[PDB]
Design a protein around this ligand. Structure first.
Ligand SMILES: Nc1ncnc2c1ncn2[C@@H]1O[C@H](COP(=O)(O)OP(=O)(O)OP(=O)(O)O)[C@@H](O)[C@H]1O
Ligand SMILES: Nc1ncnc2c1ncn2[C@@H]1O[C@H](COP(=O)(O)OP(=O)(O)O)[C@@H](O)[C@H]1O
Ligand SMILES: Nc1ncnc2c1ncn2[C@@H]1O[C@H](COP(=O)(O)OP(=O)(O)O)[C@@H](O)[C@H]1O
Lengths: 241, 249, 264, 241, 259, 262, 238
């Protein structure tokens, strides 16, 4: 008798073996990276498959969007990931029409995480196996960068990653990072990690996508830029793969 | 040689995968072949049929079905988990998008709805998924043509040219060797047949298959003429006599 | 001897002193007797003689009395290997027994097998205990290679009796051998008196005849029914120490003992 | 056996299992100490110094106030701790609403335990893998008090207590030093009492700690990182040899 | 034999040089200076004609030869399996130069999962009886192995590398018309058939076939006619036969199972 | 037998083996002067086709001690309670020759982790060699005996085996770097022929880290693409031909489009 | 091992087992019926077995005239059949009252089969162990047969059969259609089509019959109905 058949059971060792068996699911997923720096936040991606007769060109997979301010990166299951963002895109607007202003990023994840806890105990139901990254900007705290975990606990990081072989990629980030980077120090950094801890030697433009947040709006709020292929195949050759 | 975790679908193994959705797909293979190709002006879909008793009027059943005048579909897998799926689908095209946006959906906001019909199966235990995997073809004024796929796990891809069922790996190998990124329509039909030649048994005529296409307007189908912009469909399936002659080449 | 009777090739039970069939038994006349009689043609065509047969259907048909009987006509050694009585819980030692008999059959010059209840081999594998079901094919698969390897003999024939055909669908083992698969009958009402004529013989009974017997034999169409009715109808003329049967005991017998032969 | 894979059955010894297995989970968490002087309360924490990529702009915080005269501290796991903190602060501001009167601390403490009793009794539910404690002052009085809570759903009133790693070292320690024969008076000895109490676990890391105290008249005050760094030294100043 | 085999125009070549050529011509391998290979492997679905090719090689080897199908290894009393396996390879090197055949190993050659049993744990160390012999401290230059399997994608990679299986070979599928025309001409020509010879009417069909089904149809067609009190020839009305070789219709689980 | 010139591919590992083996035998006086311990046998894990067994046949060629072998599962036996007897009658044969290395190629057949539902005599004879290495009389046996075992993946086993006190080092044999892969070509090629205007590093850098033994397969096979044509000598393009081929099929079944995730 | 005592579990090879048991649980009656079209009509026969001698034979019937212009002949045990025939006698109120006109047969099979599909996704009910055959005379497409099943694979056969003697009847029927190369049958008179049917099937399996051992259904336009022992000698009269 071992304690895994249901997620409503502590172990005698004091642990919930089903939840660990969800936090391991993301290891099957694809890499995701974010960096926080001076001018604005950046993100990366890596599609799990990069075959021929399916277009990942116009069809974004790892980089959805939640508002003109906030954008995320996603991992894990796909059917249990859309409904989260299709809840987040609601909760924000249901914070706007009542309070007539934008969302603080901390409240969203605080409200998006504590439902995953809801799918951890009350009922014999699956916990949503997903490890989002949150990227956005609020005034009471400036730039921001959070991270989730299908348990329901978050963390405000500076620059981290998830997915396949992040444990090594962190080591390629822990020691070769500088807070005073503007943007492109993080870029050649970011794209250098994925180049190191991949599965195959392609690194084709289809295999990965980027994104950005920027406060370049001159006293306007913020801009985004989710790069088409023509903006990222030109930069890696402009960076020296 | 699997045990203790395919029993249900709400217990992640230590390896970190769900139980029997992986095994639903095992039937999807064991169903008949299928395919669909994206041209620069149209999209095609095709399946055979190994009608068990020849006495059956094979015309009655239809692998292909309607969703809109502009969108059509086909499976490769279990049958009776299709003919209900479509009514559960086109019912959503009306109540979801149409009656609160006036006109018919694009393809992806009609495919995303299909998924939410699917994932509601894999939510609890002792309630199985659908033993099928679909592909959808349509057109719009925003981005035009598209060819998507749908799996029982809720996921939905796009594609450019594909096959599924038995002749899946063999066909998709041939398509990579008999495809171009800037071809035309009619040669696509000249492919799908000889692609469908790959894993065929019995006959090959126009009676023992059913394939459809989409393309330019076909206002002869309309019947409600007298209006400038009340334009007709972009969907029609080809008659056996319209196919049995094309086969002659 | 150790295992089985082997019939000394001559113990001559009557394959025709029986209310069975003529078509099937003549269908078997082809695959066995014709080559062993007449090799001048299979030689002339060069086709090798046939590889075994299946005889489906549930009991009462006499699907084992004909077998050793026709074997007695040609004169081969008749033995058993009931798969229910061949399985052993150990990992091997279900396949060893297979290996003994193909060898030991060849220790004798001719020999033919009668497997029965062979569904124990051909299981659906619905449990899927890989510690077991990985071995179930292991012993089964050994049969497939032990049976037709280098054996170019015309003496070692094979039979497999299998009630419940098509319960096996792990493998139907169709292609190649099983050159026949006889469409077995049941005892038709016409065959009743064809059968009752068999066992009634060797009796002094004032006849004991009737047409009220197939109606009694209706739905009790199994050979044990007739063997036993003639048994117990024989035990009722002695129930009063009489001298010869009356046919009412037959009309009493089958009516009053096919009961167990229709309810359980 | 099999008597321990549910919440609605008794072993033949009479005791349920899934609850006190929670007490094995909470043992795997960080320290949380509390002491009351004559007129001021304190609270501690075994904060971690994990890595140089969490934003120093936002340190984490075990502690979380619910109203200006009550606080709360815990240990165990954070997700299931986030809920009842929000069901608490909600419940307090309701008591101000309905009754035009703040909350007696005992009333609050029986609401958090009033949920830890149902979330084990009615099955279809997992408990809250957390122990907590309450700290503060009643309105219109200086009466100090702290209460403990645990997932069995019972509320006690210790004067000093801890929860988690090597608590067994500490709950015996303060018994050897703290005592009602001489109740402390003000902050600098309640803190000089406490900062030394942590030392069984802290292994000499001062980037691994935070602290708070309590006011009458519905106030609080947090504390700095140098304002302990001296207290790191007076406590070591006695440790000359 | 070789000439009894049909369309193995490619596969027939690789083994009759990986087996025969060395013992007849090895000085030229080392005339470069390399070590030749030791093991091969023959993986393709059943009926594709693998187990019979070695039997052709058996007729023409002028070496020794050993037949052990994979089920023969196991017994109930543990420990005896491997010594039987050790008894093999010592017998080989004794009667050298020799080679070995196995007709199935998928009951053995597997992935070596994490076992928790005796059964699944004792099968593994049988496999270890091979590995420590095929490459350990004690090896030789006379043995070669002819493995076999109906399919090869699961047996562990530690068995699949050079030194062990330097040259493994594929087999065709069941839908490749060229050899199909070559088989009917082969098998039929070995005996006497009709002038009305509609065999260029059967090849063209889209159906998939083996080398095993062909032995069935052409035999059981030779059955129906010889059954007709006839003497030699097989009538062009064997249309019963081809359609009699439709076993998919005889599978209710392929008729009324999934739906 | 083979030798140390042939096990090229590394030096850091092999320079750690006789750190424990050759020194105590020849020179324990410093180590008795320093007088601290006596480091006993060693384990070496790595994926297959990497040179594990190869180093162990070489070392016997370069040892001066007696070198006992047990191949895969020649200790597990039919009757009961003599597998142990087959063990304790081993070491007593060692101590006759006080300097005595032993070798056992693989342990995952024997020393797998224990359970009760199955696994009998094997989980017993492991439970006495585990005694012999570090027991009372094992302290006697602990004097001069040294041990080498070469698994493939060690998470399977107990810790008690690889527990220190008897296993003081746990060596990794990973798949190599470019120059390591590059040299062993020559170690499997120098016999070949006056290879004509050739490079071999430009091809190793093509084939990323696969294994070592595979490289013995390309070289022997490359000559074979030259052996057919009576072309005794060797080509360049035959190499990047073969190495580009024999790993393709290894990259053939790795694909899958299940994709229930992202 | 599981996989069999539950419906909604796939085997690893794809095929589930529980419905396949119900596909097999139809023929516990040892009954075999037959249907065949006409030129404007359609007929259905049915073998009978009333061995015990205390059953009023008039009421034993695997026929249920659900409404006008519809018919149905069942296999599987009788009680499940009533539990299906009821739902048919319920919808034909609704489709009339809700959409205006009478149900065609094809919809009525399509609708009914979706219901038995829904009991292969959840444990509301078990699946009925029936396989049933509707007949009618359509106002647009003409006569029609449809062959339902438990899981829900319905199709329209030109003239089909059922029972444990399908292979046999599957043999001789199609032999008939290829002697003329037509799907339906000529010779309008629904009476005379019975004489075609019964003689086509006695010789099939080889047993002569009485009048008190069959039951028949006839599908003319404007009505469907059943008949007693009239016209029980013309098959032998000539
Ligand atoms: N670096 C190397 N130097 C010399 N030979 C090598 C090297 N790498 C591989 N080989 C070759 O690979 C084979 C050795 O394989 P290896 O010893 O790695 O497997 P193994 O340890 O014997 O497997 P196991 O012991 O688990 O059965 C020999 O033929 C050897 O020539
Ligand atoms: N056709 C038959 N005619 C007369 N007796 C028969 C016939 N078939 C079976 N029997 C009787 O039944 C017995 C054979 O039982 P059988 O049905 O062969 O068992 P099984 O089917 O298990 O081999 C014989 O002893 C014989 O008396
Ligand atoms: N080219 C061929 N010509 C004639 N018979 C063939 C041919 N190929 C295969 N066969 C038949 O197929 C059988 C071999 O089946 P096979 O696939 O070797 O099974 P396995 O490999 O499991 O032993 C032989 O008995 C032989 O009759």
């Amino acid at each position: 008798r071992r304690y895994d058949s249901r997620t409503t059971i502590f172990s005698p060792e004091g642990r919930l073996y089903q939840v660990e068996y969800a936090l391991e699911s993301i290891s099957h997923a694809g890499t995701a990276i974010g960096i926080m720096a001076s001018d604005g936040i950046v993100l990366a991606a890596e599609r799990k498959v990069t075959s021929t007769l399916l277009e990942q060109d116009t069809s974004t997979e790892k980089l959805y969007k939640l508002n003109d301010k906030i954008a995320v990166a996603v991992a894990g299951l796909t059917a249990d990931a859309e409904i989260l963002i299709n809840t987040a895109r609601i909760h924000a607007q249901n914070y706007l029409k009542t309070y007539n202003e934008d969302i603080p990023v901390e409240i969203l994840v605080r409200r998006l995480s504590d439902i995953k806890q809801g799918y951890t105990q009350h009922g014999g139901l699956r916990p949503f196996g997903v490890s989002f990254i949150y990227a956005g900007y609020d005034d009471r705290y400036g730039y921001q960068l959070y991270t989730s975990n299908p348990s329901g606990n978050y963390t405000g990081w500076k620059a981290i990653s998830v997915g396949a072989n992040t444990s090594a990629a962190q080591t390629l980030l822990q020691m070769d990072y500088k807070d005073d980077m503007k943007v492109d120090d993080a870029i050649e950094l970011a794209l250098k990690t994925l180049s190191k801890t991949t599965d195959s030697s392609a690194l084709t433009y289809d295999r990965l996508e980027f994104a950005t947040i920027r406060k370049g709006a001159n006293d306007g709020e913020v801009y985004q830029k989710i790069f088409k292929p023509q903006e990222i195949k030109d930069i890696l050759v402009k960076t020296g793969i | 040689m699997t045990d203790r975790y395919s029993f249900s679908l709400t217990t992640f193994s230590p390896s970190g995968k769900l139980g029997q959705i992986d095994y639903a797909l095992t039937a999807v293979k064991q169903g008949v072949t299928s395919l669909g190709i994206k041209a620069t002006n149209g999209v095609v879909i095709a399946t055979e049929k190994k009608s068990s008793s020849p006495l059956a009027m094979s015309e009655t059943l239809s692998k292909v079905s309607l969703l809109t005048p502009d969108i059509g579909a086909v499976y490769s897998g279990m049958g009776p988990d299709y003919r209900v799926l479509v009514d559960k689908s086109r019912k959503v095209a009306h109540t979801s998008y149409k009656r609160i946006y006036g006109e018919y959906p694009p393809t992806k906001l009609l495919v995303s709805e299909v998924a939410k019909i699917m994932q509601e199966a894999t939510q609890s235990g002792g309630v199985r998924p659908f033993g099928v995997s679909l592909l959808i073809a349509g057109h719009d004024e925003f981005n035009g043509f598209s060819l998507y796929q749908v799996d029982p796990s809720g996921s939905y891809f796009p594609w450019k040219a594909t096959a599924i069922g038995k002749g899946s790996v063999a066909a998709k190998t041939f398509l990579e060797k008999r495809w171009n990124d800037e071809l035309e329509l009619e040669d696509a039909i000249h492919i799908a047949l000889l692609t469908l030649k790959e894993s065929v048994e019995g006959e090959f005529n126009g009676d023992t298959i059913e394939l459809a296409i989409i393309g330019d307007e076909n206002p002869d189908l309309l019947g409600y003429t007298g209006i400038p912009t009340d334009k007709g469909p972009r969907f029609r399936k080809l008659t056996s006599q319209e196919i049995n002659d094309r086969l002659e080449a | 001897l150790v295992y089985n009777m082997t019939s000394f090739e001559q113990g001559e039970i009557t394959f025709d002193g029986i209310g069975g069939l003529t078509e099937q038994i003549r269908e078997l006349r082809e695959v066995i007797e014709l080559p062993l009689k007449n090799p001048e043609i299979f030689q002339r065509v060069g086709i090798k003689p046939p590889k075994g047969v299946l005889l489906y259907g549930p009991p009462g048909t006499g699907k084992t009395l004909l077998a050793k009987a026709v074997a007695a006509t040609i004169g081969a050694n008749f033995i058993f290997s009931p798969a229910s009585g061949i399985v052993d819980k150990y990992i091997g030692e279900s396949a060893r027994i297979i290996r003994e008999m193909f060898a030991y059959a060849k220790e004798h010059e001719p020999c033919i097998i009668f497997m029965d209840e062979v569904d124990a081999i051909g299981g659906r594998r619905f449990s899927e205990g890989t510690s077991a079901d990985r071995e179930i094919q292991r012993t089964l698969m050994e049969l497939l290679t032990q049976m037709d390897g280098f054996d170019n003999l015309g003496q070692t024939k094979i039979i497999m009796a299998t009630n419940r055909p098509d319960t096996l669908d792990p493998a139907l083992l169709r292609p190649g051998r099983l050159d026949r698969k006889v469409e077995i009958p049941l005892p038709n009402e016409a065959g009743r008196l064809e059968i009752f004529k068999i066992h009634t013989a060797k009796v002094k009974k004032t006849g004991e005849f009737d047409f009220e017997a197939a109606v009694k034999m209706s739905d009790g169409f199994n050979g044990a029914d007739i063997r036993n009715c003639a048994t117990e109808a024989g035990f009722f003329a002695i129930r009063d120490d009489r001298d010869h049967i009356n046919p009412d005991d037959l009309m009493k017998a089958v009516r009053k003992v096919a009961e167990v032969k229709k309810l359980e | 056996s099999g008597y321990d894979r549910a919440l609605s059955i008794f072993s033949p010894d009479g005791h349920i299992f899934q609850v006190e297995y929670a007490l094995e989970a909470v043992k795997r968490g960080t320290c949380a100490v509390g002491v009351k002087g004559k007129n001021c309360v304190v609270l501690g924490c075994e904060r971690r110094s994990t890595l140089k990529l969490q934003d120093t702009r936002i340190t984490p915080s075990k502690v979380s106030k619910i109203d200006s005269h009550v606080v709360l501290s815990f240990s165990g796991l954070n997700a299931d701790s986030r809920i009842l903190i929000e069901k608490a602060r909600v419940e307090a501001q309701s008591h101000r609403l309905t009754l035009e009167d703040p909350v007696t601390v005992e009333y609050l403490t029986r609401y958090v335990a009033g949920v830890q009793q149902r979330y084990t009794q009615s099955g279809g539910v997992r408990p809250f893998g957390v122990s907590t404690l309450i700290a503060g002052f009643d309105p219109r009085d200086d009466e100090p008090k702290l209460y403990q809570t645990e997932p069995s759903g019972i509320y006690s009133s210790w004067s000093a207590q801890t929860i988690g790693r090597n608590s067994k070292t500490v709950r015996e320690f303060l018994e050897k030093n703290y005592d009602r024969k001489e109740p402390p008076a003000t902050v600098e000895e309640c803190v000089k009492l406490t900062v030394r109490s942590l030392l069984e676990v802290v292994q000499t890391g001062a980037k691994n700690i935070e602290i708070t105290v309590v006011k009458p008249d519905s106030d609080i005050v947090a504390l700095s990182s140098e304002e302990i760094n001296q207290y790191v030294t007076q406590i070591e100043q006695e440790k000359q040899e | 034999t070789y000439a009894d085999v049909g369309g193995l125009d490619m596969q027939k070549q690789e083994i009759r040089e990986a087996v025969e050529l060395p013992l007849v011509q090895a000085d030229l391998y080392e005339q470069i200076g390399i070590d030749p290979p030791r093991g091969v492997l023959l993986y393709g679905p059943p009926g594709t004609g693998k187990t019979m090719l070695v039997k052709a090689v058996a007729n023409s080897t002028k070496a020794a030869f050993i037949r052990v199908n994979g089920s023969e290894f196991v017994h109930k009393y543990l420990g005896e399996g491997p010594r039987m396996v050790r008894d093999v390879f010592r017998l080989a090197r004794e009667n050298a130069p020799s080679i070995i055949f196995i007709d199935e190993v998928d009951s053995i050659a597997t992935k070596r999962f994490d076992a928790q049993t005796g059964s699944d744990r004792e099968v593994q160390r049988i496999l270890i009886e091979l590995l420590t012999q095929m490459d350990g401290f004690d090896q030789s230059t006379n043995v070669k192995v002819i493995m076999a399997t109906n399919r090869a994608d699961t047996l562990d990679p530690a068995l699949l590398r050079p030194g062990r299986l330097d040259r493994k070979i594929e087999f065709p599928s069941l839908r490749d018309r060229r050899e199909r025309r070559l088989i009917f001409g082969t098998i039929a020509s070995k005996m006497s058939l009709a002038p009305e010879a509609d065999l260029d009417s059967l090849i063209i069909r889209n159906d998939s076939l083996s080398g095993a089904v062909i032995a069935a149809i052409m035999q059981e067609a030779g059955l129906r006619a010889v059954r007709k009190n006839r003497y030699v020839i097989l009538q062009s009305d064997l249309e019963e036969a081809y359609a009699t070789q439709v076993k998919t219709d005889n599978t209710v689980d392929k008729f009324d199972f999934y739906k | 037998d083979s030798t140390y010139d042939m096990v090229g591919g590394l030096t850091k590992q092999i320079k750690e083996i006789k750190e424990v083996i050759e020194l105590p035998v020849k020179h324990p006086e410093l180590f008795e002067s320093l007088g601290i311990a006596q480091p006993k046998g060693v384990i070496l894990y790595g994926p297959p086709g990497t040179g594990k067994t190869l180093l162990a046949r070489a070392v016997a060629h370069h040892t001066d001690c007696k070198f006992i072998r047990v191949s895969g599962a020649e200790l597990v036996q039919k009757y009961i309670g003599e597998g142990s007897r087959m063990v304790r009658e081993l070491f007593v044969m060692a101590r006759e020759h006080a300097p005595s290395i032993i070798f056992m190629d693989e342990i995952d057949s024997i020393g797998s982790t224990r359970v009760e539902g199955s696994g009998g005599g094997d989980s017993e004879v492991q439970r006495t060699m585990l005694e012999l290495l570090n027991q009372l009389d094992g302290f006697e046996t602990s004097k001069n005996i040294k041990i080498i075992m070469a698994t493939n993946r060690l998470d399977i086993l107990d810790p008690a085996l690889l527990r220190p006190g008897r296993i003081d080092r746990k060596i990794e044999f990973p798949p190599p770097s470019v120059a390591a892969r590059a040299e062993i070509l020559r170690i499997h090629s120098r016999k070949m022929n006056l290879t004509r205007g050739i490079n071999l590093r430009k091809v190793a850098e093509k084939m990323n880290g696969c294994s070592g033994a595979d490289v013995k397969g390309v070289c022997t096979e490359a000559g074979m693409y030259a052996l057919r044509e009576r072309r005794i000598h060797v080509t360049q393009e035959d190499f990047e031909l073969a190495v580009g081929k024999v790993m393709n099929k290894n990259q053939e079944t790795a694909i899958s489009v299940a994709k229930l995730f992202k | 091992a599981g996989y069999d005592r539950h419906i909604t579990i796939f085997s690893p090879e794809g095929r589930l087992y529980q419905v396949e048991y119900a596909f097999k649980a139809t023929n516990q009656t040892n009954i075999n019926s037959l249907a065949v079209r006409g030129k404007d009509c359609t007929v259905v026969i049915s073998q009978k077995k009333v061995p015990d001698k205390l059953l009023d034979p008039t009421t034993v019937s695997y026929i249920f005239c659900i409404s006008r212009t519809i018919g149905m002949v069942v296999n599987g045990p009788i009680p499940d059949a009533r539990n299906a025939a009821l739902r048919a006698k319920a919808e034909a109120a609704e489709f009339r009252y809700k959409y205006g006109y009478d149900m065609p047969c094809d919809v009525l099979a399509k609708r009914m089969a979706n219901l038995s599909q829904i009991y292969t996704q959840r444990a509301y009910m078990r699946p009925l162990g029936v396989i049933l055959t509707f007949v009618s005379v359509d106002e647009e497409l003409g006569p029609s047969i449809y062959k339902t099943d438990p899981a829900g694979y319905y199709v329209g056969y030109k003239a089909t059969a059922t029972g444990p003697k399908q292979q046999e009847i599957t043999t001789n029927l199609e032999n008939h259609f290829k002697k003329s190369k037509i799907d339906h049958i000529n010779e309008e008179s629904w009476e005379k089509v019975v004489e075609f049917a019964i003689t086509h099937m006695i010789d099939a399996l080889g047993t002569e019959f009485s009048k008190n051992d069959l039951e028949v259904g006839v599908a003319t336009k404007d009505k469907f109905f059943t008949l007693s022992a009239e016209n029980i000698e013309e098959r032998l009269v000539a």
